[PDB]
Design a protein around this ligand. Structure first.
Ligand SMILES: *C/C=C1/C(=C/c2[nH]c(/C=C3[NH+]=C(/C=C4\NC(=O)C(C=C)=C4C)C(C)=C\3CCC(=O)O)c(CCC(=O)O)c2C)NC(=O)[C@H]1C
Ligand SMILES: *C/C=C1/C(=C/c2[nH]c(/C=C3[NH+]=C(/C=C4\NC(=O)C(C=C)=C4C)C(C)=C\3CCC(=O)O)c(CCC(=O)O)c2C)NC(=O)[C@H]1C
Lengths: 315, 315
């Protein structure tokens, strides 16, 4: 049970320190990472309610001009499908995904989820068999630690990340790196233990519900949403289900201090509890493409189940 | 433990009947389904050793002219990768996959696996997020039967198959349909039980090792390989790892008698034992594309693990 949140800084909340980091409202930063754009919309009317300030970079119309327009006008082809895919009351982790044309190279990937009566739309530029292959070595791994070793190697191979760790939580929420795949020459974190405060309780709770999060560029400034509050509620917009959610500034400083240029992790959830993380670092900024992120989510699921099976036959 | 095999018909084996069907050598039919082409090659030299007789339809050179040519000549780009992907001693279920250009519409999908010192190459014309989405309802299913119901619905949605069943094996190898998703108007098989002989012991044993098999057109005549025997061994070529493997004629007659035009199943393997099948029927011929088959293999894996978890919490 994490403490009550601070108000976010845009509601006059206090500054975060190492003495109160467990109270930062990381699920409502009111801003996104700059490598994509985000809109929110009324889940019945499809009226656009909020827009990231960088929307015209990705969507080609000004945020103030998009505001109030319907997704039926904006996304004629996708709106019926979107609407049917994400009915009121559906899980906030359920996603609608489509690919959109745009004047630039590649395409625009659209990812949508629903929170209450709000649709949250994420747009990012983009220019499974290996998963399938991997499941053999994951299945044949003789025990938990062997599974962990295979899993980190597989993820490195899929992603090209400089470092991939499987971080395991202890009952006191301290953690240990129990497996690591890394580029030659990088110093090892294998076996290193870290205190519970490295991943504070409100983060652990969010990561139990929304199983993948990332920081594409640990030096990139966040982009505010406008208006910052959801008009439906006159309250902050929950962004925990959006990969574009801005990362805690305190965690980004931690990553920079570590010499990390990009970070990504996937939760390993067993019996509804956070068991650990597949934790990835790159030395430079890196936008993992949406199809590869989807594959990592799927491996996270598969790994969660295999952990539960490998641990059981120790009983 | 299945009985010893009959020799295949091309080695003077006896005709199959309902009294001896458990002895049909289904893994070595010496022939393929006609919607693709197959080559085999020496795993060191890449010399082509065998060719399906229909190769020129898909590859544009005569089988007798391909024979003896190296994959380095035939597939310059892919051969180093192929070779590195499938080293001697690797699992015979491990696959290399690539997409090839050809003069026709779409592309040519290449799938390769290794059996001993033989590479087996399958070529078929072709013109994951839904998987990811599905895992939520699979995870939230409260028990085994609910999981089964979600799984058959998901597979129907992914594939558009007229009927999708989860067939569960009993300890005496009889089976029961414990879940079914079907097009409106189709009579139900839900709850129906079938004798052990419907899926004979040598089939059950193959399906424990090679987890997906299909009959794209239950009226299509098989296409012989040439030469029919692998020159390395002067013995039949094992095709259980090739989806293009010709289906037992006895099973194809069964499917036609059932009014099935296309069939596909995926094994559910738990603790190394065959627990059951995701069994799919279409009323007409249907070539499920290779990327969708790959997705079904991945769901089969995930379902196997979830079955094991849902059944355990009954203990
Ligand atoms: C008092 C505040 C601090 C704090 C806040 C914080 N930390 C996170 C999220 C993560 N911290 C992680 C820690 C590690 N990464 C590593 O590589 C290692 C060791 C090799 C450790 C211990 C990780 C993995 C995460 C998850 C995010 C990610 O994968 O990059 C948050 C939440 C961030 C967010 O989602 O917005 C916060 C608020 N961390 C501290 O150490 C103290 C100073
Ligand atoms: C004595 C020989 C017979 C026999 C041989 C046989 N059967 C199979 C494979 C399968 N049989 C299946 C049975 C069913 N499909 C259904 O829909 C239902 C009920 C609704 C049943 C009972 C299934 C599912 C398979 C797997 C293949 C597939 O999914 O289509 C084989 C092996 C075929 C092969 O891989 O080459 C053989 C030799 N089956 C009999 O009933 C007796 C007459």
């Amino acid at each position: 049970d994490p403490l009550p949140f601070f108000p976010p800084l845009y509601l006059g909340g206090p500054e975060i320190t190492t003495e109160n980091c467990e109270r930062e409202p990381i699920h409502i930063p009111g801003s996104i990472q700059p490598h994509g754009a985000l809109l929110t919309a009324d889940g019945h009317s499809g009226e656009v309610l909020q827009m990231s300030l960088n929307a015209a970079t990705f969507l080609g119309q000004e945020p103030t001009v998009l505001r109030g327009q319907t997704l039926a006008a904006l996304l004629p082809e996708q709106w019926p499908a979107l609407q049917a895919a994400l009915p009121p009351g559906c899980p906030d982790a359920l996603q609608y995904r489509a690919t959109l044309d745009w004047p630039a190279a590649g395409h625009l990937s659209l990812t949508v989820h629903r929170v209450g009566e709000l649709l949250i739309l994420e747009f990012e530029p983009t220019e499974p068999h290996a998963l399938r292959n991997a499941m053999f070595a994951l299945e044949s791994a003789p025990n938990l630690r062997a599974l962990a070793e295979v899993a980190t190697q597989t993820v490195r191979e899929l992603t090209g990340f400089d470092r991939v760790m499987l971080y395991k939580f202890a009952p006191d929420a301290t953690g240990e790196v129990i497996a690591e795949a890394r580029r030659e020459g990088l110093h090892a974190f294998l076996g290193h233990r870290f205190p519970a405060s490295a991943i504070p309780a409100q983060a652990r709770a969010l990561y139990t519900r929304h199983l993948l999060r990332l920081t594409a560029d640990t030096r990139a400034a966040a982009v505010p949403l406008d208006p910052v509050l959801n008009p439906q509620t006159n309250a902050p917009t929950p962004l925990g289900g959006a990969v574009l959610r801005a990362t805690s500034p305190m965690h980004m400083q931690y990553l920079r201090n570590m010499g990390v240029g990009s970070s990504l992790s996937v939760s390993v959830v067993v019996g509804g509890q956070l068991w650990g993380l597949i934790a990835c670092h790159h030395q430079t900024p890196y936008v993992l493409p949406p199809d590869l992120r989807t594959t990592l989510e799927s491996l996270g699921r598969l790994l969660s189940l295999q952990v539960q099976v490998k641990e059981a036959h120790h009983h």
